[PDB]
Amino acid sequence: RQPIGLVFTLLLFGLALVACYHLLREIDPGALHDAIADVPRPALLGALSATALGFVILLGYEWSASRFAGVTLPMRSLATGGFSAFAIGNAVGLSLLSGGSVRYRLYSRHGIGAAEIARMTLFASLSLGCALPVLAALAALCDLDDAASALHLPRALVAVIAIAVLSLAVGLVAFLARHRLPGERPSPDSLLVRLGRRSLRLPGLRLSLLQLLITALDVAAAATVLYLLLPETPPFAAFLLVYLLALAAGVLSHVPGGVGVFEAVLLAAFAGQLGAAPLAAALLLYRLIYVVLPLLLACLLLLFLEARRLWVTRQAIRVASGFAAPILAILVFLSGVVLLFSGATPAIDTRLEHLGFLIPHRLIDASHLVASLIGVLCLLLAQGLRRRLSAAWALTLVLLLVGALLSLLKGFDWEEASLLSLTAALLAMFRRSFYRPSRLMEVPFSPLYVGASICVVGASVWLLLFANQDVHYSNQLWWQFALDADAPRALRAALGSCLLLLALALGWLLRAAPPAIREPNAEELQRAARIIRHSDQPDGGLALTGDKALLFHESDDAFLMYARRGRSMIALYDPIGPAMQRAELIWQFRDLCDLHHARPVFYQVRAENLPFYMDIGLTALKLGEEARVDLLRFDLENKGKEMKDLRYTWNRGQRDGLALEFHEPGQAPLDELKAISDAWLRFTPAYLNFFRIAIVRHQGKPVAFANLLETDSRELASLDLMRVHPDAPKLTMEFLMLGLILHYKAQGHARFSLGMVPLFQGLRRFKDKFQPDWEPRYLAVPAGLDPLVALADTAALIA
Amino acid sequence: RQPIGLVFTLLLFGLALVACYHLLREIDPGALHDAIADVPRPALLGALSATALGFVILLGYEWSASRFAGVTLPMRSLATGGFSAFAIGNAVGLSLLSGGSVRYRLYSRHGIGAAEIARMTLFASLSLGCALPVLAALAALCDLDDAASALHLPRALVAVIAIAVLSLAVGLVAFLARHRLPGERPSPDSLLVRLGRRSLRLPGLRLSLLQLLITALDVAAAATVLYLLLPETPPFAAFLLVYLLALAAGVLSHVPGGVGVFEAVLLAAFAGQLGAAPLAAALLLYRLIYVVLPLLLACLLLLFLEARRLWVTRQAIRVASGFAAPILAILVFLSGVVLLFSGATPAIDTRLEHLGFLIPHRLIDASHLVASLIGVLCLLLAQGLRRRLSAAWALTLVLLLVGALLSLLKGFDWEEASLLSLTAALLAMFRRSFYRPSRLMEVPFSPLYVGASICVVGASVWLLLFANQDVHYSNQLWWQFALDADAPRALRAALGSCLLLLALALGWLLRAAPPAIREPNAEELQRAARIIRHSDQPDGGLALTGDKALLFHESDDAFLMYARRGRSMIALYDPIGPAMQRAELIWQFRDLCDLHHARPVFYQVRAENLPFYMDIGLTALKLGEEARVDLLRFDLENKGKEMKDLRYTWNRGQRDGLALEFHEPGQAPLDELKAISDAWLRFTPAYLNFFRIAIVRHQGKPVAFANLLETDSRELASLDLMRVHPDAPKLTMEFLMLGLILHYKAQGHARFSLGMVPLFQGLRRFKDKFQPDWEPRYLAVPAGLDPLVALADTAALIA
Ligand SMILES: CCCCCCCCCCCCCCCCCC(=O)O[C@@H](COC(=O)CCCCCCCCCCCCCCC)COP(=O)(O)OC[C@H](O)CO
Ligand SMILES: CCCCCCCCCCCCCCCCCC(=O)O[C@@H](COC(=O)CCCCCCCCCCCCCCC)COP(=O)(O)OC[C@H](O)CO
Ligand SMILES: CCCCCCCCCCCCCCCCCC(=O)O[C@@H](COC(=O)CCCCCCCCCCCCCCC)COP(=O)(O)OC[C@H](O)CO
Ligand SMILES: CCCCCCCCCCCCCCCCCC(=O)O[C@@H](COC(=O)CCCCCCCCCCCCCCC)COP(=O)(O)OC[C@H](O)CO
Q: Rounded to whole angstroms, how far apart are CA atoms B124 and B609?
């Protein structure tokens, strides 16, 4: 899907650029500049106002999603999440940070579930998507003649299509209303409908109406931003209709911004009626104001909140896995876009004239080319930044400063230089955000990032051909080094960019194959065992089974056991070591899964590492609850119903003649354990002789055994393998672990772990007999929240 | 001394600047520029060659010092130390990194003693100093008429003075040769002479001659650098004579470079004969070529070796305390000098003309002023860099980049911008070098750094008055903002610099008084005890006496006990904690001693921290040797004469009826210990009840006791207080500690410490009875290696 999807995305973008070139054949870059200058200042204020209103409406859009999801959030939190998710989501789309990914980060702080947020994301997306046909049909149904003239279709055709769409909408509404199950309601404003296979959660009448009213205002507001920037305007009905169709086309095309396809359609519709230059100026300004501007504001706002959090909560925040890294990848990617577009466009004659006297003329040429190569590097380095490489941080920050300098030496492009500097200043402030010391050369290949770069370089060649159309091409142009020669400086830069990008991408893709997964050897198992001993987490003992691969840190103070099943790679617990080592190992595991084209899954993780799992792009799903008794507050002279039941079990066990013995590793009765294991029925001598075995006996004869996970410290201790005979008494087992607890209380262990119950009722009650302290255990899995998949699933179930 | 010395240094510099202004009254900056352009290219090559020869001679100068000191070093090491120490020493003098400080750092790697190096430094300095009168006299004695005409003195006078100097030199040589003690010789090429009070170590005849021949060539070579840059030249005899006198005056004046006083004297001598412009051009070029150039080369070379060491030895080097920090302080200080001098000098009319079209004219003014303030900040921040503040690193690196930018916006000063950029690029490479996270606002006041800044700002106003002499001053000049107005841009900058410098210096000096030293409270003692437990070093137990101040880290994972005696502040051991915590605490202690105007002394330190003590500017003196027995290789079934003597002592002790008992803290027989302490004669219950006490008894009655320093780990354990009765057997004590060793061997301790012997013979033998492992213990003290003090001491002893 990914490769095909990405290819058909690039084609669409490419075809759209061709379309835009043909539609602006009769216009020169002069006429565009004049058209941009022409639009009055009241119109720009009108646009900016309409933009502000149109982004306030999206907050209410976010509120409705929370009501649907049954999520209570503070107003300031909904506001921020509404704005940032819609502002970044609309701009960069899927390429970099998406709407869902923003929502999830932001709304994980308040303890909103991963399921809820997903259901908030889906509702935010689908509600526009599914309203867009209805809104369009209605728009066309006012003044059909104008709509017909705009689309250049027969009046009868567009009439029946609109009617058909409305009728189908009504028929669908009536159908899903038919299967409305009464009684139960997930949220105040929701329904649960049934179709036979799956239950489906739909908004209520009131919420559906309200959402449609919000969607209506939002569209209108957005279309109005464009409508005000047009000197001469068509009837608004037809103009809205077209805008909605262009918007649809942009969405379907899966082009990040909608860029190219949107413009192409608008241009197509109103090529002749309005004229190219006014429309093309309006479309550019519309993009800057309604798309780029709120993105920058959102980016800044999120960086600001990050910076604040670092300033106030200095102690709490340690490893830094927040918003700075994605946001700064975006800004650095935009910085590379600026550099590349700047180069394609010719310079101001006045500036070149004067800068010719300050600089050697042949250095202008050199500066111009180098700036364009740095631009390409900036596009690719954006990935490295996203993955929190310190190398990437340093190299970027150098290239931005050199790029800002060569911006001044090129054509005194002080606007480009100012943007690049400002990006550098931001990137600098967040040095600690990029904390991984991995090599840049070991970043896994990302088709998306390569696809994006190719698009940008494509756009820049489109701009080159448009901006330098006044010159007659010739073979000699390539070798002209003058000052007045602006076209040759474009050409050479263009070729340089394309070649470097091609080279890097080939040098990235044609790389050595990654080594195969192998079970650990004796040395590794011994090194794992060492780490486990000099650590807190005893659950790490399962590593020493030697049936699952071990991934070691560079410092070799930490490791992370995992195993490949099907197309996924399941890690068994959190990494084993300090917080920084844990963060580096989680990133290492992402890297390792990306190199093997496998889905990174983490099994049974604690809540303390959930932000790091968020960082590499996983969602925490509530797997099960792990019960662990506290030995500090546990005493055998206390009172309680369950405590009295336990003391009864204990004393009855002692009177019966049950005895408990502890054997250190190496001196275990292997013959007995084998016989017991066989009677019950991994169990290997190598695995068993790593741990201390507690054996309980009934009147001398061994009645059960259990190996004990334990570290050199006394913070925690667990049990993994534990088998009892069918013929053994029922209270013997309960006596056993009670004996284990007593022994650990004598040794002065802080805590003791029993185990995890998933979702079992009998096991849950049995654990609850000791009155333990519960703690949630999560599962980490990738975030598969594609609107299209969900809509296709809904449509399939409905049909 | 320091304040007086610094004041009389500034006065001399000031008076010299006045002198230089008066001597260049008849010359304009035009005539100087022409004179600089005039000097031919063969002459510059001749100068550069003579410089290279004159720095090769200094290597042989360094060799002779090693022979005198009796130090064997590799040729490449002598070379580097010769060059760097003479190149930096000559340039910056005493202000920043000095010759001795370079030698000590460089020659500590090879395990050259602190005493040796000091003796190498003194010999390197004094040999020139004491040869300069002889060389001068001899020079004057060739062609007396020319020498008389140059000095404008009578021929008879200069004749008798020269003769007197030579006669006194011969008479001194004969006198010190009289008291030449035969037999013993510290080195092959040395003598030991006696005068009654102190023994004095002088070079041999052969070494004295050779040194004089080296000194002769070196001077000649240096004078020749200047002689070639003169179009019209006086007789070389007289020219040399003057150069030596000017050199003397420069040295005596204690002006860092010799700058001002040297030029003043040369100028004075050859004002009229040669003409101002040629001479003043020669003197400037001489400074650049023979002083500034080798300094930059040395700086680069030392940075290169640092960079290499970081690249190759990544694992070994951890905390980074080498050459980068001092060297980069110098470069940053020079960067501030460039900015300040650039501002005082008017701009090129051509560049302003063209840059007027690219920039707003009133932004040139703003850029010009801001650049001059950044210059001043750069001068002061140089200190912060030296003390390895990360804040200083970040702030500098920002100011250098902004300063480089405003250099371009000012008058397109692309040379200033290039230097500043290059400094920034270097500073960036060594980010890790500046690792302390202290506040900038808490740096202690350094009069020297303030004095240096005032000199620079003084020089810049001297340059302002010289470079802008063509304009008529008026009150209105201050308020003229034009483009062609270069003098007002100087004035405003000058005033701004002076005011900012004054303000900062007052804001630095008038600061709150530092809190007084107080003994620790119960909480601190308890927190110290905690640290000691969770650590390796048990010697830290002496902290819990509570008679000595404790200095804690910010993390509170480390501390450093110290006590004030007289005018010094003695720390008792190394800091207690990790390597990074140790480095930060040592710097903290330097800071604390600088705020109380006390000499930082470290007592009984290990060799592992010696580089950090080097960093804050201490010299390791061999205090004593600490013996610690290794329990891994120690066994009671081994063979050996001493081992058989120990086993005999043990079994005889057991048969006699000696018994050893171990009491945990809290359950000590206080009554007994008190009685034993009284019988022997800090001893307090609070101090005693922190440690486990081992009590040996003779037939039941307690015969001795000894508290045991110990941590939670088993890496090491010691004994501090240990008293025995006069009437107790002689072998009872030896049995006691043997019992202690046996007990620690049973507990599985890695090592065990006995104690330190200073320089005692009986104690040394007693320790050697157990066949221990010796390890040197050092004392850290400031480096008081002022040539003048040593010469005054020598002169006083001779007389
Ligand atoms: C009309 C002319 C206008 C001139 C411009 C005037 C205004 C300039 C204002 C610039 C201020 C922005 C720079 C702030 C960056 C944050 C500093 C920082 O933290 O830097 C980090 C990175 O280190 C740096 O030094 C980075 C320097 C890069 C800064 C780049 C931005 C300045 C750009 C200036 C113009 C450059 C030239 C462009 C045109 C060619 C170090 O972080 P740390 O955590 O390691 O250390 C913190 C320390 O412990 C204290 O707590
Ligand atoms: C034309 C619209 C209709 C058809 C659309 C379909 C075809 C798409 C392909 C082309 C789309 C973009 C074309 C126009 C974009 C701007 C062109 C432009 O002017 O580019 C300038 C440079 O390129 C841009 O400005 C690109 C703008 C787009 C992206 C901007 C992102 C902003 C953020 C960047 C990172 C900074 C982050 C820190 C800030 C918080 C260079 O030209 P200049 O002559 O104006 O500049 C020279 C001199 O400096 C001043 O005159
Ligand atoms: C004719 C035009 C010529 C144009 C110039 C062309 C040549 C430019 C070459 C510049 C290269 C020098 C910069 C190298 C600096 C070392 C990078 C570095 O390590 O930076 C540290 C500081 O971080 C930075 O990003 C500092 C950036 C500052 C660099 C400043 C020098 C460049 C100046 C360019 C011109 C600026 C404009 C001047 C005029 C206004 C980060 O160290 P770290 O240990 O934290 O990270 C290491 C990582 O883990 C990998 O192992
Ligand atoms: C005059 C000599 C006899 C009398 C001496 C007694 C009086 C002493 C007081 C003055 C001493 C210095 C006077 C002359 C120094 C240089 C003057 C000069 O030219 O200054 C320029 C700037 O100042 C300097 O160059 C100062 C040089 C001295 C210190 C240099 C240190 C070098 C290292 C700096 C740090 C960089 C580190 C990285 C490199 C490895 C600005 O003038 P400009 O018109 O030449 O420049 C404008 C334009 O850019 C090009 O024309």
A: 28
**CB neighbour list of residue B646: distance below 8 Å, 6 or more residues apart:** B734, B738, B769, B770
List, by residue range, all CATH 3.40.630.30 domains of chain A: 633-749
CATH tag, A522-624: 3.40.630
- What resolution in angstroms, rounded to 1 decimal? 3.3
Q: Give Cβ neighbours of residue B263 (< 8 Å, ≥ 6 apart).
A: B16, B20, B280, B283, B287
- Assign domain B522-622 to a CATH class: alpha beta
| A vs B: CB pairs below 8 A | 19
| Ligand 3, atom 17, residue with closest C-alpha | B429
- Give the C-alpha distances (Å, rounded to integers) separating B482 from B297, B356, B368, B478, B486: 41, 11, 13, 11, 8
Handedness of CA A384, A390, A393, A396 (dihedral sign): negative
Q: Which residue has the tokens 């409705």?
A: A64
A413 touches ligand 2 (CB under 6 Å):
yes
Q: Distance (Å, rounded) from C-alpha B606 to C-alpha A377? A: 50
According to the 3-state scheme, what is the secondary structure of B424-462? Answer: HHHHHHCCCCCCECCCHHHCCCCHHHHHHHHHHHHHHHH
The CATH topology of domain B633-749 is Aminopeptidase (3.40.630)
**CB atoms near residue B82 (< 10 Å):** 25
The phi, psi pair for A626, rounded to 5°, reads -105, 125
Q: Which ligand is nearest to the CA of B371?
A: 1
Ligand 3 pocket residue status of A429, Cβ below 6 Å: no
Rounded distance, CA B601 to CA B613, Å? Answer: 10
Rounded distance, CA B249 to CA B153, Å?
Answer: 18
Best residue in B315, B357, B429, B556 to probe A by mutation, most A CBs within 10 Å?
Answer: B357
Return the half-sphere exposure (C-beta side, CA atoms, 13 A cut-off) of residue B126: 22
Most ligand 4 atoms within 8 A of CB, residue of B12, B331, B345 to mutate: B345
- How far does Cα A584 stand from its chain's mean position? 18
CA distance B642 to B766: 11
Of B407, B292, B427, nearest to B339 (Cα)?
B407
Print burial letters for B133-156: b (CB count within 10 Å at least 16), e (below 16). bbbbbbbbbebbebbbebbeeeee
Extract the tokens encoding B204: 């041999």
Question: Which of these, B450, B449, B446, B444, lies nearest to B595 by C-alpha position?
Answer: B444
Strand bridging mode A701-710 / A549-552: unpaired
Half-sphere exposure of B262 (CA within 13 A, CB side): 22
Q: Within 10 A of A312 (CB to CB), how many other CB atoms are there?
A: 10
Q: How far is it, in rounded angstroms, from Cα A6 to Cα B738?
A: 79
Q: In sequence order, which ranges of B93-235 are alpha helices (DSSP H)?
A: 99-108, 114-141, 144-151, 155-178, 205-228
Residue B621 · residue B752 · CB < 8 Å: no
Q: What is the distance between the alpha carbons of residues A58 and A128, in angstroms, rounded to a whole number?
A: 11
Which of B585, B596, B329, B556 has its CA nearest to residue B449? B329
Q: Please, which residues have CB within 8 angstroms of residue A587's CB and are 6 or more apart in sequence?
A: A387, A388, A436, A438, A615, A616
What is the side-by-side order of every strand in the sheet holding A199-202?
A180-181, A191-194, A199-202
- Long-range pairs for A417-426: beta carbons < 8 A, 24 or more residues apart: A419/A335, A419/A338, A420/A335, A420/A338, A420/A339, A423/A331, A423/A332, A423/A334, A423/A335, A424/A397, A424/A400, A426/A303, A426/A328, A426/A331
- Angle of helix B390-411 versus helix B414-429 axis, rounded to 10: 160
Contacts of residue B416, Cβ cutoff 8 Å, sequence gap at least 6: B338, B339, B342, B404, B407
Q: Which residues of B touch A418 (CB under 8 A)?
A: none
| DSSP string covering A420-458 | HHHHHHHHHHTSTT--B---GGGPPP-HHHHHHHHHHHH
Residue B657: count other Cβ atoms within 10 Å of its Cβ: 10
SS3 assignment, position B702? strand
